[PDB]
Write a protein that binds this ligand. Sequence first.
Ligand SMILES: [Mg+2]
Ligand SMILES: [Mg+2]
Ligand SMILES: [Mg+2]
Ligand SMILES: [Mg+2]
Ligand SMILES: [Mg+2]
Ligand SMILES: [Mg+2]
Ligand SMILES: [Mg+2]
Ligand SMILES: [Mg+2]
Ligand SMILES: [Zn+2]
Lengths: 248, 93, 106, 69, 135
Amino acid sequence: GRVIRAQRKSGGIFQAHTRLRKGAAQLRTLDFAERHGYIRGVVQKIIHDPGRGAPLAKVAFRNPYHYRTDVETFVATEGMYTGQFVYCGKNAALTVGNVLPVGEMPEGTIISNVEEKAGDRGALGRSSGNYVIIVGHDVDTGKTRVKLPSGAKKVVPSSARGVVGIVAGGGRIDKPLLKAGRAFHKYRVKRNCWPRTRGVAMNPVDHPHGGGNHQHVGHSTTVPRQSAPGQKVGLIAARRTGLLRGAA
Amino acid sequence: TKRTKKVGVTGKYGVRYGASLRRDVRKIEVQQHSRYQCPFCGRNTVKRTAAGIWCCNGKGCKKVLAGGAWTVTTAAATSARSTIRRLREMVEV
Amino acid sequence: AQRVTYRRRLAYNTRSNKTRIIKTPGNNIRYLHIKKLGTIPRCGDTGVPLQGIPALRPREFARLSHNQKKVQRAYGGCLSANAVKDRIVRAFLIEEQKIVKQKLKQ
Amino acid sequence: PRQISDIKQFLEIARRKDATSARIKKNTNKDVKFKLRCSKYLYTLVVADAKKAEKLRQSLPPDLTVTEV
Amino acid sequence: VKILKPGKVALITRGRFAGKKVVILQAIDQGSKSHPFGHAVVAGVERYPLKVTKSMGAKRIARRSRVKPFIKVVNYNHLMPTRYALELDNLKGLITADTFKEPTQRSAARKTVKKTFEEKYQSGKSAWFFTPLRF
RNA sequence: AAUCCGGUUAAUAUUCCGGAACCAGAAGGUGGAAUCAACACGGCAACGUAAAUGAAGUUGGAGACGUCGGCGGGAGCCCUGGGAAGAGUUCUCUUUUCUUUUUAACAAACCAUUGAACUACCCUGAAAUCGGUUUAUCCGGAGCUAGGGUAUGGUGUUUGGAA
RNA sequence: GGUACGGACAAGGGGAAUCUGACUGUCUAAUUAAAACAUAGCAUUGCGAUGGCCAGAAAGUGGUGUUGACGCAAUGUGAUU
Ligand SMILES: [Mg+2]
Ligand SMILES: [Mg+2]
Ligand SMILES: [Mg+2]
Ligand SMILES: [Mg+2]
Ligand SMILES: [Mg+2]
Ligand SMILES: [Mg+2]
Ligand SMILES: [Mg+2]
Ligand SMILES: [Mg+2]
Ligand SMILES: [Zn+2]
């Protein structure tokens, strides 16, 4: 057989379309001011980022060591506005938009763009409408427990920073796309992943699902976790299948 | 005159896509094209510019607001703010 | 009636191939190749176009006299009049507040 | 090309060293154009009078080259 | 209760001297034929003196500690009043609505203001007045 | 960054010729301007001028941006009424029918007049009996209407070029 | 007045039903344009980054990723009801 489509997604025509993107959305390099105090920035712009649901905020900070201003690109939280002051650091207040160590915020606070490691500059809860919940602190050997959008519980060090509030851009997925063309335009600014041909619509040379005098898979579509590339298609390492009626 | 009993703004789609789909789009489209009130200026000159971005007109408060995809504020964001404010006001005192 | 041709080898209606029709003193209808239109500088705080300054391509500004490229006022040619007024009042009031907060700190 | 609206201004430009030559153009409408060729510009003065044209022609520097069209 | 009165220090907010600190000389609350609005006659600092330190020489300090003043009639709406006020020794009746009609009297009034402002700068009793506002 | 017209050859031309310009760089050749101690004045203001010292550093702007829809102006074209010059037709008719009746880059002054603005901004003033207003319903105590100003300025006007 | 006149030119035939694919879109260049493919919608699967999927002979190597579950990856079904 030939190299299946999933195996060809290794670069080339499958790279991300990034010309129209203004910059990665990052927290700010963890520095002396944030470790010990706070630093104030002003929201200069709130902008659309092609390929991203959530809007981005360009935030201007004074450089502590040089006569210069540093512009940061943040994931905008809902409620943020241009001209707003945001404060980042250990002593920042618990206000929507501020950036604080998760260990400095009480249990139950709603946060976004949370670091997995202290200083990684934001990993968790970044897509539109998403957030992370503080679940508890363990002061001895400081580790904070958080709930992720997937429902998983994670332990981050109580120095990983987070942004107070929910990512802006609301309930985007509530609107039916309604048309192939709208899906076309959504993925045109993302990557070459649409439209998708079904495996069973192919010939055996193309896909493990291909071939047959009717369109059918043949063997089970739940394939083992340790399948080789080229046979790892369908429902990979599925714990179960079918329409769930009540889950947790 | 009424010009439409049901489809409203979704009349542009005609008979395509299915009634339920057009009805769901109709509820969202009415939201995303509505005018909302600016809390900082008091005028109803708040309209959307691209999905989470709500702008204001006039010579005053040319600011831009980060909001929901289809409405200026979401219920989740509003509930989070009061939750955050309660938590802020209980460690403060 | 008289029909025209591009005077350059650029054969396509691009933004660098702008033209307009002239009638010559030989009674000839022909193209004149013209530049893109200029742009007035914009306020750094509000984005409004700044008054008192002509709309030119960027390098044409190198040929004007100094006073044609600015306004005789603080931040002239860089900030609008109303933006400067906001800055002056804001700076004064904030400085005064820093004075009272220092006085009441002791 | 530049137009000169004052006879005093035109005579001053003629007395300058760049002023090589002058031209006299007599239009059908009995108006007379005095054209001064400098290095960069050609300066025209429109004289609408024949009496004034004669006085201006006599008012020129004596060494100036005045050419008739 | 009247914010704008002679001796008060104000900030110009519009015009060529925007951001320059001025002292009110006359407060014409009612509008005249020339300037039909609540205007004031003011004297302000067009060029503030430069800071001087102990390492400077004597001649250099003299150069830096100079004031170039201006005199102007300003609409009240183009003034931001302050809380400071100046003493206004001999700038009492020297700048009326008549020195502006004559450039000779204008230069004479400015020279007089320059002398009092400069002497007032040395031995600083109003330091805030001669420090530029940064904005 | 910056070039136009007219002409010219068997055959090149925004390249040659005639005429008229423009840009960039270098040196500084004159003239002017400011400065007697220091780097100009005017205007309430928007902002104005023939010039109007400005190193490092910083910040801002221009370059610089989709698509559809109608509305308003300009230029060339098209059409039309006279005059002129030549031509076609003319048993009869046709004060007829046809052709020509042109004006560049660049420079200057004006400029919503004559066509397109209350477009943006400023000043006075303080609006319910609310008014203003687009084909399209937006605007106003965060200052409407009105009155007067300031700026943006040509493929507009009047000229130079240029008959 | 030729009972003629969108006078040439230009320029829809219409209706009642059944099978089938919802629709617009796409392909066997040179025998197949379709009921095939795609599609919105519906559902399932993996994965919280010391990760999932993909790559490379190797690497102090690459893609997804200017990304973070309202995401990326892997399948099925095929608008609505
Ligand atoms: Mg097949
Ligand atoms: Mg196979
Ligand atoms: Mg040839
Ligand atoms: Mg079909
Ligand atoms: Mg075929
Ligand atoms: Mg065929
Ligand atoms: Mg199918
Ligand atoms: Mg279905
Ligand atoms: Zn507002």
